[PDB]
Nucleic acid binder design. Structure first.
Ligand SMILES: [Mg+2]
Ligand SMILES: [Mg+2]
Ligand SMILES: [Mg+2]
Ligand SMILES: [Mg+2]
Ligand SMILES: [Mg+2]
Ligand SMILES: [Mg+2]
Ligand SMILES: [Mg+2]
Ligand SMILES: [Mg+2]
Ligand SMILES: [Mg+2]
Ligand SMILES: [Mg+2]
Lengths: 50, 63, 50, 107, 59, 31
RNA sequence: UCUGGGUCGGGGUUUCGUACGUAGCAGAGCAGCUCCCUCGCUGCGAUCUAUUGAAAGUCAGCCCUCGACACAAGGGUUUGU
RNA sequence: AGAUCUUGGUGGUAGUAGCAAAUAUUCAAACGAGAACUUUGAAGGCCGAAGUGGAGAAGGGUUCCAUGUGAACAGCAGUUGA
């Protein structure tokens, strides 16, 4: 986690065009690699793997 | 092997407590043969039993 | 997402990068060096570096 | 070979962290023995009395943070024993622990 | 990115860091951390604390 | 008399403790 | 494996706050020496100053190493339409 | 078959509750089949003279001392022991 500073664009608010400090969470996301495909079929018992 | 009697007799002969009695850890067999106060005296003479010096309690700080 | 909380444009002005391993007080290495100047270990490395 | 002797430095502070006051020096001895077993692969580890005196030098709870020891692997070919090798860990007094690598030492 | 403030130690206080102290007499002080705040509250002089900016520029 | 081999091992037997303890005076065998 | 993970070491971060020693015509003063000095020298003395944001710790559940060292294709018990 | 029956034996509970008042142990060696607990040495501590020290009265009665044993006992162990 860390925190940022940004200007708010919320009309009618007390923080309108005002700076705020907001806590943010950093989530590292290296690209996903696609290795398969699953198909599902709708059954009267639910979805089942086809 | 077990030298409780030797420590007690050495304390009695040396006129000190069992704290100050030092038995030679290498001559355990020779000391174990000592069963009488004459033999304790002989061991003290021969250097196998030593009265350890009094723990230092200085008064230089007090002075 | 139709509320004004959502679909609101976000424009950051500052991201805090102070050290989180304590009470960090310098954003970058260079800012810390420019504030604190040379140190003893810098001097002993620089004497060896001629 | 197998009669090698080496000089290590052990982060006692790293291995004792979190241990209660009345347990820090006995756990220091246990971690020293475990370190010797791991480094030399010998379950039979003998610790010099000078090393024990150095670990216990500052009492039971203020154990030194670092210590320089010497692990010597020696031939236990003295009697019929399950282990034919053993490690004698001796104490190496040093002034500073900066830039001390693990170095092989000759006989 | 906002107005940069200075502490009891003279260090820059970035947004979202430290505290701000407003006295009854009308003076507003800002501190970088609780160490500087406790030093200020105990009326310690920054010109005698070795790591403060004021001591550095005094010596 | 004392030579280098005798001296280097003599240092061991006279020390019966760490720093601050009295030195061993003698170890004499007599039958 | 285009090796790996450890253990030290290093660097980064951070915590505290300026280490031992040395030097000082710094220091409340005090005690001796006067061919000496013409205002000096020799000790004691909390504290101060410089060396010195120094010293010390920092993963054990902090970050990065490619420096050093040794170690890692090994052990056991089972499982079949 | 009963009498919260008498005496004796045995279960479940159950390898469970529990073996937590008074700071603390560690290293090496010896004996030994066998050592966390015995002994020696080294270290770290404690009682701190209104003591966990040194001696008595009452009470105990051989617990004193040495040697030997490792059946039982010392609610773990023991090469030790009242
Ligand atoms: Mg943090
Ligand atoms: Mg490091
Ligand atoms: Mg019946
Ligand atoms: Mg239980
Ligand atoms: Mg219990
Ligand atoms: Mg004490
Ligand atoms: Mg005491
Ligand atoms: Mg009494
Ligand atoms: Mg008896
Ligand atoms: Mg029992």
């Amino acid at each position: 986690m860390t925190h940022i500073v940004r200007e708010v664009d919320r009309p009618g608010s007390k923080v309108n065009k005002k700076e705020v400090v907001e806590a943010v969470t950093i989530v590292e996301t290296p690209p996903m690699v696609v290795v398969g495909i699953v198909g599902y079929v709708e059954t009267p018992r639910g979805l089942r793997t086809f | 092997s077990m030298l409780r009697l030797q420590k007690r007799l050495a304390s009695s002969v040396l006129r000190c407590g069992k704290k100050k009695v030092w038995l030679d850890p290498n001559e355990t067999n020779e000391i174990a043969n000592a069963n009488s106060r004459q033999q304790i005296r002989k061991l003290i003479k021969d250097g196998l039993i030593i009265r350890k010096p009094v723990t230092v309690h200085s008064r230089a700080r007090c002075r | 997402q139709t509320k004004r909380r959502a679909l609101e444009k976000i424009d950051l002005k500052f991201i805090d990068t102070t050290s989180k391993f304590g009470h960090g007080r310098f954003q970058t290495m260079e800012e810390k060096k420019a504030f604190m100047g040379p140190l003893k270990k810098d001097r002993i490395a620089k004497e060896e570096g001629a | 070979n197998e009669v090698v002797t080496r000089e290590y430095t052990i982060n006692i502070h790293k291995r004792i962290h979190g241990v209660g006051f009345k347990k820090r020096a006995p756990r220091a001895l246990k971690e020293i023995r475990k370190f010797a077993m791991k480094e030399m692969g010998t379950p039979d580890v003998r610790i010099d009395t000078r090393l024990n005196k150095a670990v216990w030098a500052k009492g039971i709870r203020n154990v030194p943070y670092r210590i320089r020891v010497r692990l010597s692997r020696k031939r236990n070919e003295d009697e019929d024993s399950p282990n034919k090798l053993y490690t004698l860990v001796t104490y190496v007094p040093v002034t500073t622990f900066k830039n001390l690598q693990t170095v092989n030492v000759d006989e | 990115m906002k107005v940069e403030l200075c502490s009891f130690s003279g260090y820059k206080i970035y947004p979202g860091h430290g505290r701000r102290y407003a006295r009854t007499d009308g003076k507003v002080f800002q501190f970088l951390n609780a160490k500087c705040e406790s030093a200020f509250l105990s009326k310690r002089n920054p010109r005698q604390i070795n790591w403060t900016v004021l001591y550095r520029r005094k010596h | 008399i004392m030579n280098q081999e005798k001296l280097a091992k003599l240092q061991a037997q006279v020390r019966i403790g760490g720093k601050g303890t009295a030195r061993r005076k003698k170890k004499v065998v007599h039958r």
